[PDB]
Write a protein that binds this ligand. Structure first.
Ligand SMILES: O=C1O[C@H](CO)[C@H](O)[C@H](O)[C@H]1O
Ligand SMILES: [Mg+2]
Ligand SMILES: [Mg+2]
Ligand SMILES: [Mg+2]
Ligand code: NA
Ligand code: NA
Ligand code: NA
Ligand code: NA
Ligand code: NA
Lengths: 1015, 210
């Protein structure tokens, strides 16, 4: 029957004998345990060691397994993904389905996971009441047997499947048999851009309920106009035999104080001609001056639901955390408790580099802490309902949650092929309805989502309306079919740009500013995905936040995304390395496109995270003369854990500093008058830095946490006092092959064949391993390569334009090399043309002036042909002989920063170990740049000017040739790249050119100057 | 003190090279102890008769962004025609140059002055690679205006009919020039991208006879 029915190739059958979905139950038999959320004896975990066997298809599974353990089976930890234990390969594919597109059919070669457990059940559990098993997550489908008898079937990998085992179990030893199919008709609705895995990957538990039971409960909170009064409404449903002596009590607690309570027998109000629900009751509780829930202040009450007899005998209790909050869209704005939200959000997949898609509390808490510490207030459950603990943690720590149905059909052609088909409506409906039934009592969930990338079908419209009707308390959004369909309350585009339109046929991505005011449009706009954080990215991030702040109806967005989906593999010595698509022999695959995070898989931050933190700051600053104006972007809280630190420095040297407590109302302003600053003696630029510090520890941060910062240039005193001229004179030595400059025992060698500084000497010590040459190229970033799929060679991508123009192949042709003696210096003049097959790309004209103080002043003027693609950089490079420990600079830092991603960086004197000047992006590229640098120090060298630089043991050539960071080898000496100019990194998306015009090197003529000397 | 600032000489040296003479200068413009601007220049005169001028200007970050960064002189020549390779033929400024076309233009000198009834800076042409006036040629990438009226006369005079042709021809060659604005005329209306706020400025010019 089981093999005959092939229920996993039938979208009409998504379950057999599965129990109704409901909010989290524990069946407490002690009311205080319910109140305080203590563990319940009636809720047992079946997590731990199970037996597992892998088969190539369900037809390969022996019958004996239903009744007896397989001797060849292994013992494994559950929850797990079986790919993580090495039974088969995890597959990374983005859009293209991992199986042949032939709905509802799946491959006959269908990897099958045979899980089994021998466990004890106590007689007391079977003598009365109901014993159910709960599978929180099984990917992608499964049949269940108990003691050899078939129980049921379940689909949807991301919601719990529950089955009544009361009639199947015996006192003492029992055996479960679970056949998990990797592929099913459900897989057609699970085409998320992530690793494709399978198995029992979330918790398994047993729950005992009395026969007469709480089967469901819904909690609503409604408010008067000023939120000074609320009504808590609790609808409660029972199963079992109705009796007149039955009662429901709902009590509401704040800490240990009961603030409200109501008791009633069952029997709802009249609903229609046939009466009412005899098996339901609604309790209404008045609450004066409720403490309101937000991500700012996550105030929680506790609601306890008791099923009992009239004379006071408890049957059972259930409970939940209640957050008093109202979510509504009014006049085109998303409001929480009457105030317009600004969503500082991120998309977060459930991913662990070791455990795959198994989630644990420690990782969840770590993510939330890092999110809040980096000024995020919101998370999107991309693209499925999460592990149930996630919502509990969001309720308590305070994050706004978009809860999303497990529906994505991206690989369909067209994208709505299934979602417009009424045959797929039952399967889609269960993915929506069972999510709502499970999560509707969590205050952190403020918005429902119908899924992602499934086009726009009639099924979406039906399900949009179902939610609107069943739960009016939360807006519904959905991006498919152009982000502004009739199935969404919120314009929710993915990677729509700030100012630039992308007018795709049918589904255009308008400039977000333009989108709001399209004829007849009135809704708020919140990007469900933006600022694609793939590799060296988040260029232009500040542009989004300026617009978010300027436009009331631009209420923010969710960054794509939180965490790199890299996996751990090991070399022959057992050293772990980060793997991406293809590294497991998985094919076809989409390579590094699984790594889009602000953090590495182990939760180490990418440089881009600090840019996000800074732009998402909750305090805004303006300076006018002596006065700092601080504006609060909090909606609900006063600044009661904040003080403003200010410091004034002259070129990194502290001049004055001080503290002022912040006392700003939500949305308010505070004016801070700085004292008289003593005028500095020496020349240079004064810089003002302010930082907002939290003196007191919180649930989410340590004492001293910095939440906000800003910098201004103050007075500048230009250097006019010409330095006292040294008495020494450099000498020019000319041969046919070289111009050599000598000062004391210092030597500068210029090759006359090549026209470059080929060597420098301090006495007998060599300074260079490679000559100092112009560089116009970078090892391509993921945004430069610009493909979302591995098999696309895209002529429009920046890298392809550079390659085809001959940028990486360009050979230097010497046009001029002369040497002149001056009164106090030697002057070397050079010109070079870079050409590709007859075409001049760039011309570089230089002068090197070596004076008696041993300073080499390099002047560089570059012409760039207007018809060549704008170069990635305009600078110089060389391999230095020296390897030093520290890197010291006056400029923007301390972290990596690029022209379109440097707002978070501060101007000061920074000093880091050399290793910190390299960013270990799993896919290697140009990295570690620091901009607006006036002085750089390394070993015996000092460079002064106004440049961008990076410095590392890896050449641009190695970086562009190597696919994985673990494969990189330190080279002899140190590679230095000093740029007059560097192109933006972009990142609005990573599959089309995304570097904004103002960050492209398009000026045609460029000038920069450097001084190289010994320090 | 932008209109009051006097040039103070910091450096003036001359070196003889293989086929050229190199003059190096440095000036600071100060107002009541405050250094507004620093100009550093080299003039390279070679055997072909060309003078290559390299100009590097520092602008104090806390002084109001300057109206222009350039050079001026009164030429002795009064010639009938002005010939340039650049944007034109009409007056155009950095934030008002979209209508202008790049080409070889040739106009009578009088067309290089715009007779605004209230006199001001006028007649600029941008994106110019070559300018010809009498025996003179200037090459580079610059903005220029050229007329019988000095900037001083224009700012001192209230009505265009009160202007008088001065002895030679005033030439203003700018490396950089501020936007003119106009979103309104009663508050600062020049957009940030057209203000001269970069702090350090570089331009180069070749002056020769044709
Ligand atoms: O539009 C999207 O872009 C991302 C690219 O990495 C990723 O595929 C998301 O799941 C998808 O919603
Ligand atoms: Mg099915
Ligand atoms: Mg997708
Ligand atoms: Mg715990
Ligand atoms: Na806004
Ligand atoms: Na991705
Ligand atoms: Na405070
Ligand atoms: Na690479
Ligand atoms: Na005037």
């Amino acid at each position: 029957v089981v093999l005959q029915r092939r229920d996993w190739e039938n979208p009409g059958v998504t379950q057999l004998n599965r129990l109704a979905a409901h909010p989290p139950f524990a069946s407490w038999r002690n009311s205080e345990e319910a109140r305080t959320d203590r563990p319940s004896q009636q809720l047992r975990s079946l997590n731990g060691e199970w037996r597992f066997a892998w088969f190539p298809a369900p037809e390969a599974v022996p019958e004996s397994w239903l009744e007896c353990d397989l001797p060849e089976a292994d013992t494994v930890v559950v929850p797990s993904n079986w790919q993580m234990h090495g039974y088969d390969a995890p597959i990374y594919t983005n859009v293209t389905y991992p199986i042949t597109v032939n709905p509802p059919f799946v491959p006959t070669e269908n990897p099958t996971g045979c899980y089994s457990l021998t466990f004890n059940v106590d007689e007391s559990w079977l003598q009365e009441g109901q014993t159910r098993i709960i599978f929180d997550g099984v990917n992608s489908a499964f049949h269940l047997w108990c003691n050899g008898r078939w129980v049921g079937y379940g689909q949807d990998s991301r919601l719990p499947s529950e089955f009544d085992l009361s009639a199947f179990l015996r006192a003492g030893e029992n055996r479960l048999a679970v056949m998990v199919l990797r592929w099913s008709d459900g897989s057609y609705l699970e085409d998320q851009d992530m690793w494709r895995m399978s198995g029992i990957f979330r918790d398994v538990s047993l729950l005992h309920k009395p026969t007469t039971q709480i089967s469901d409960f819904h909690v609503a909170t409604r408010f008067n106009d000023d939120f000074s009064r609320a009504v808590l409404e609790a609808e409660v449903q029972m199963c079992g035999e109705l009796r007149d002596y039955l009662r429901v009590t709902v009590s509401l607690w704040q800490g240990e104080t009961q603030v409200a309570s109501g008791t009633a027998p069952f029997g709802g109000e009249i609903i229609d001609e046939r009466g009412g629900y005899a098996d339901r009751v609604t309790l209404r509780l008045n609450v004066e001056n409720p403490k309101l829930w937000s991500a700012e202040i996550p105030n929680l009450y506790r609601a306890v639901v008791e099923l009992h007899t009239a004379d006071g005998t408890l049957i059972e209790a259930e409970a939940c955390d209640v957050g008093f909050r109202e979510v509504r869209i009014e006049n085109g704005l998303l409001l929480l408790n009457g105030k317009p939200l600004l969503i500082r959000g991120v998309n977060r997949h459930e991913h662990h580099p070791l455990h795959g898609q198994v989630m644990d509390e420690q990782t969840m808490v770590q993510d939330i802490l890092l999110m809040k510490q980096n000024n995020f207030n919101a998370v999107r459950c991309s693209h499925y309902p999460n592990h149930p603990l996630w919502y509990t943690l969001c309720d308590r720590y305070g994050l706004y949650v978009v809860d999303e149905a497990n529906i994505e059909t991206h690989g369909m052609v067209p994208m709505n092929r299934l979602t417009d088909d009424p045959r797929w409506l039952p399967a889609m409906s269960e993915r929506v309805t069972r999510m709502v039934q499970r999560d509707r009592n969590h205050p952190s969930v403020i918005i429902w989502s119908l899924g992602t990338e499934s086009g726009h079908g009639a099924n979406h419209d039906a399900l949009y309306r179902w939610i609107k009707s069943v739960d009016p308390s939360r807006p519904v959004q959905y991006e498919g079919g152009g982000a502004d369909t009739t199935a969404t309350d919120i314009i929710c585009p993915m990677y729509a740009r700030v100012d630039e339109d992308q007018p795709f046929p049918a589904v255009p991505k308008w400039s977000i500013k333009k989108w709001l005011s399209l004829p007849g449009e009135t809704r708020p706009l919140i990007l469900c995905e933006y600022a694609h954080a793939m590799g060296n990215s988040l260029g232009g991030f500040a542009k989004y936040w300026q617009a978010f702040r300027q436009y009331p109806r631009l209420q923010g967005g969710f960054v794509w995304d939180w965490v790199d989906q890299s996996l751990i593999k090991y070399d022959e010595n057992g050293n772990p390395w980060s793997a991406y698509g293809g590294d497991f022999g998985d094919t076809p695959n989409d390579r590094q496109f699984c790594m889009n995070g602000l953090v590495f898989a182990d939760r180490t931050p990418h440089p881009a995270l600090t840019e996000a933190k800074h732009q998402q700051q909750f305090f805004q600053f303006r300076l006018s003369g002596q006065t700092i104006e601080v504006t609060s972007e909090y909606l609900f809280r006063h600044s009661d854990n904040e003080l403003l630190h200010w410091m004034v420095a002259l070129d990194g040297k502290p001049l004055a500093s001080g503290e002022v407590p912040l006392d700003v109302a939500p949305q308010g302003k505070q004016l801070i008058e700085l004292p008289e600053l003593p005028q500095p003696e020496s020349a240079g630029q004064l810089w003002l830095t302010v930082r907002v510090v939290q003196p007191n520890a919180t649930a989410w941060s340590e004492a001293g946490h910095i939440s906000a910062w800003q910098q201004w240039r103050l007075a500048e005193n230009l250097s006019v006092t010409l330095p006292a001229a040294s008495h020494a004179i450099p000498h020019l030595t000319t041969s046919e092959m070289d111009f050599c400059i000598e000062l004391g025992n210092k030597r500068w060698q210029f090759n006359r064949q090549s026209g470059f500084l080929s060597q420098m000497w301090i006495g007998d010590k060599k300074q260079l391993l490679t000559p100092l040459r112009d560089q116009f190229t970078r090892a391509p970033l993921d945004n430069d390569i610009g493909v979302s799929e591995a098999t696309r060679i895209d002529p429009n991508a920046w890298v392809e334009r550079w390659k085809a123009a001959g940028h990486y192949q360009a050979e230097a042709a010497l046009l001029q090399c002369t040497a002149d003696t001056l009164a106090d210096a030697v002057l070397i003049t050079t010109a070079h043309a870079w050409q590709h097959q007859g075409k001049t790309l760039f011309i570089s004209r230089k002068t090197y002036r070596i004076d008696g103080s041993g300073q080499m002043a390099i002047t560089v003027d570059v012409e760039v042909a207007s018809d060549t693609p704008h170069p990635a950089r305009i600078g110089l490079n060389c391999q230095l002989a020296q390897v030093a420990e520290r890197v010291n600079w006056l400029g923007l830092g301390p972290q990596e920063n690029y022209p379109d991603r440097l707002t978070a960086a501060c101007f000061d004197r920074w000093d880091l170990p050399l290793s910190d000047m390299y960013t270990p992006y799993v896919f290697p590229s140009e990295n570690g740049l620091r901009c607006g640098t006036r002085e750089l120090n390394y070993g015996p060298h000092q460079w002064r000017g106004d440049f961008q630089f990076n410095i590392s043991r890896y050449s641009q050539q190695q970086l562009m040739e190597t696919s994985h960071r673990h494969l990189l080898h330190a080279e002899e000496g140190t590679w230095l790249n000093i740029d007059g100019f560097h192109m933006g990194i972009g990142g609005d998306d990573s599959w089309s050119p995304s570097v904004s015009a103002e960050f492209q090197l398009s000026a045609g003529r460029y000038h920069y100057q450097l001084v190289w000397c010994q320090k």
